[PDB]
Structure 1
């Protein structure tokens, strides 16, 4: 039988999450028969990756960052690489994604098309990786995603001392205070030290309250990728209890995405916000440019997995569930998101597609499960 409420103990919460993930894996594989059991791809924990499997993905990411970009030069003069095209369209559509009826499905399609670019343009045969936050909640610097070795998405940045508190002011709600992390500067080690971030910043938070915004975040400004891994941020919004609480106590699609992103006026940035700002640095603290951090795709693999688990717990009522509109926090008011709403990814990959073709990981263009 399945867990009913989330546990206040960290080990038990991991067991419930596992048992909920096993229930989700079971429901999906037993239904499937263009998608079969034989081409059903599997996404796995980045720790389940071998140190040779890690290098294949990293090498496939490094290759996409070296191919020429597809976006027209006038629409984004700062885009140079195939990697920049995905970042460019995320900057372009930040106002109509996030806190929208399309938030969860747009990012499921976003990461899927990012995988296709790896498989078709940089010859990737491995599995898509995801980052389990709760496993690294007590020591993010030891996390195999951020440990600074050459099997990581690079590690911490240079420790800038005497850094001010990060203050987050979205909307007109009172600020949320966060520690500045143990880094702050350019990344040290890892296979991405010479990775040149090209676009942004658009709305980058800074230690001390400021927000660096460029005149046009689509213009060319090459720079390094900065990081300041903040373990304290993870153990506040990303422990195993928080992850299982997000799944077991969200009973409608509204409560799920709201709790996931951070309920307004609640002092919580949710699992989505806490996963972004824990990396710190640039573009870690920029909601527009965050795909510029290579740990974005492992982060959203886990976001999709948490949505995938919650969906299967009641496929009758949760597969096609949608709530929200087409504008950030319905500001200003916009029509309700429906199954007929068409979204696109700009010039990154793919074409415009309706929402109903996105709700299932074993339908539409999708054919995959999680382990």
Structure 2
């Protein structure tokens, strides 16, 4: 018998999440037969990767950051690498892939196709990782994703003292205040210390309230990845209670995707905004360029997982459920998203595909599950 209310105890909620996740795993694996149980892939918590497993994933990402970019130079002058190709299409489409009916599915297809690049162009044969925020909400610096060792996605940014607070503005609502974290400078430890962020900033929120924005964020702007790990943000938005809340208290797709992303004006940024802004720095604090932070892919692995859990809890009603339009917060107004709506990743990978073919992890081009 599944839980129905999220516990306020962290240990309790974590066990509730396991139960629901196991429920969804059972639902997926039982119904599967192109995708079969025999060729079904499994995505796992970063913490369950062995040291060699972690290093194989990291090395494949590094490979992508070394290979020439496919995007025609005249459409994205700043692109240099295959990794940049994914950042550039995200930047290019930010205003029709967040707070839209396509947000969840687009990102599902996005990370799938990023995974395909690792496998087909960088000889990656491991499992797709996800970052379970709940386990790190008490100390982000100790997260295996961000501890700075050679099995992490590099570490914190170097310490910059006396940083003012972050002030997140959307529309005309009052700013959401956030502390600035423990870093702020370049990330100079771990396997990405030599990584060059090449695109943006498009809309970079800064300590103190300012926002930096390039004239054209697709032009060349080589610089260091910065971070300022902010545990306090995870403590507010990404604890195991908040994760289970999101799954159990959302009765339709609208409430789920909006609770996940944060209801504008509500004071909360959800698990999705909480994971992003907990990284801090650059592009961590830039909704357009966020894939430029290597932890993006683990973050959205967990996003896709929580959606997949929520879907499988009431499959018949939820698998193909869509709500919202084709424009950011429906500004300007645009038609409702439908199963016939087509999305694409530009020159990053793959091709145009209908929403219809993205709603199940065991259908269309998808054949995977979460453990």
Q: Same fold (TM over 0.5)?
A: yes
1:259-291 residue CA offsets vs partner (Å, 9 max, x unmatched): 000011110000000000000000000000000
Question: TM-score, normalised on structure 2?
Answer: 1.00
Distance 2:265 2:203 in 1: 20
Give the corresponding residue for 2:297: 297
* Cα drift, residue 255 of structure 1: 0.2
1:219-260 residue CA offsets vs partner (Å, 9 max, x unmatched): 001000000000000000000000000000000000000000
* Cα drift, residue 171 of structure 1: 1.2
Structure 2: which 5+ residue stretches go unaligned? none
Give the corresponding residue for 2:323: 323
Structure 1 counterpart SS, 2:96: coil
1:325-354 residue CA offsets vs partner (Å, 9 max, x unmatched): 000000000000000000000000000000
Distance 1:4 1:351 in 2: 39
Distance 1:223 1:38 in 2: 44
* Cα drift, residue 112 of structure 1: 0.2
Distance 1:20 1:194 in 2: 40
Structure 2 counterpart SS, 1:167: strand
Distance 1:334 1:200 in 2: 27
* 1:238-317 alignment, distance < 5 Å: 238-317=238-317
Q: After the TM superposition, list the runs of 4 or more consecutive aligned residues in structure 1 that deviate by more than 3 angstroms.
A: none
Instruction: Say how many residue pairs are matched.
Output: 371
Distance 1:348 1:316 in 2: 33
Compute the RMSD of aligned alpha carbons: 0.4
1:113-142 residue CA offsets vs partner (Å, 9 max, x unmatched): 000000000000000000000000000000
Distance 2:198 2:353 in 1: 28
Distance 1:169 1:37 in 2: 46
Distance 1:368 1:349 in 2: 19
* Cα drift, residue 172 of structure 1: 1.0
| 1:115 correspondence with 2:101 | no
* Cα drift, residue 188 of structure 1: 2.5
Structure 2 counterpart SS, 1:185: coil
Question: TM-score, normalised on structure 1?
Answer: 1.00
Structure 1: which 5+ residue stretches go unaligned? none
Distance 1:264 1:228 in 2: 24
